[PDB]
DNA sequence: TTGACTCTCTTAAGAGAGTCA
DNA sequence: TTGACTCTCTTAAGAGAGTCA
């Protein structure tokens, strides 16, 4: 299939196209009561999206290039990582939004990690709130906090101990 | 079933039966370098499981009772919460294992909360490591830690800023 | 070769309901 | 009435592949 040089060319064309997406400034919690700023490069809400891009689901897109008469297609956020290993610890690598903004395709807002690691960032206290992720979070996770638990642990009788 | 007395009777029979499950001691990380001990009441691996209980999936069970000559059935971990609201902020309430042990049916190890709150406990630093859950965690989440990220945010050109 | 649609699948925290004996 | 099986569905973080012009 594609040589590593051809893969680099795909990454470069992807960056050139994404770099022309609308750039949206967002103020975000960092943890520790501090606020910061992220600049997201947001794919449009409806077609046309940009050269090579098409929507396969409500918040899913793919990037497609045809090379030597063969059509190649990738998940739209996976392209920055095409020269990296695609699994770790027996788990598939996934594109993980550090900005928690699905439409964003800024490669400086993405990392490449297991789906469990990816999901867990939703609850991280953030880079100024105690983040221990080795590839550090850019912001506090949107779901961090005390939660909204309706009922806690309880028993009616005396059959149980903790 | 319908009446509050009938619901109370269901909860009481469930507690009596689960109270006879084997009690298994598990030592657990609490965060902050500390360890604690939990006593889980574990449903058997194979039939018979206990009066009223049947397995509907590899780690899914249901509890069943006949009331007014009709069968009423519930997810096996939902029974303690039958007098509670079944939603919160428009999200379905779910049984959430504070001990992260699916076979356990100890109601002192369960709470009732949105699926997002439920999931997020997998990454909590724990009651001695910074848990902020209002209904406090019993242990550090099994997935807490630095992660195993294969590649971090990166660009080849100069089109992007954080 | 390209755009704009269509479809189903993965994961791991959770669910509801039917078929037999 | 009770037990022991069978099936598919929900969610929100993520995927692969087909059709037509
Ligand atoms: Na994510
Ligand atoms: Na859980
Ligand atoms: Zn972004
Ligand atoms: Zn983090
Ligand atoms: Zn337990
Ligand atoms: Zn917690």
Author numbering:
A (entry chain A): 2 to 163
B (entry chain B): 202 to 363
Authors' own words:
I-PpoI is a well-characterized intron-encoded homing endonuclease member of the physarum polycephalum slimemold. A large subfamily of one-metal-ion-dependent nucleases consist of histidine-metal (His-Me) nucleases that perform critical tasks in biological pathways such as apoptosis, extracellular defense, intracellular immunity (CRISPR–Cas9), and intron homing (homing endonuclease). Surrounded by two beta sheets and an alpha helix, the His-Me nucleases active sites all contain a single metal ion, a histidine, and an asparagine. The asparagine residue helps to stabilize metal ion binding whereas the strictly conserved histidine is suggested to deprotonate a nearby water for nucleophilic attack toward the scissile phosphate.
The diffraction quality of the crystals was not affected during the soaking. Even in the absence of divalent Mg2+ or Mn2+, the active site including the scissile phosphate was already well aligned in I-PpoI, which is again different from RNaseH.
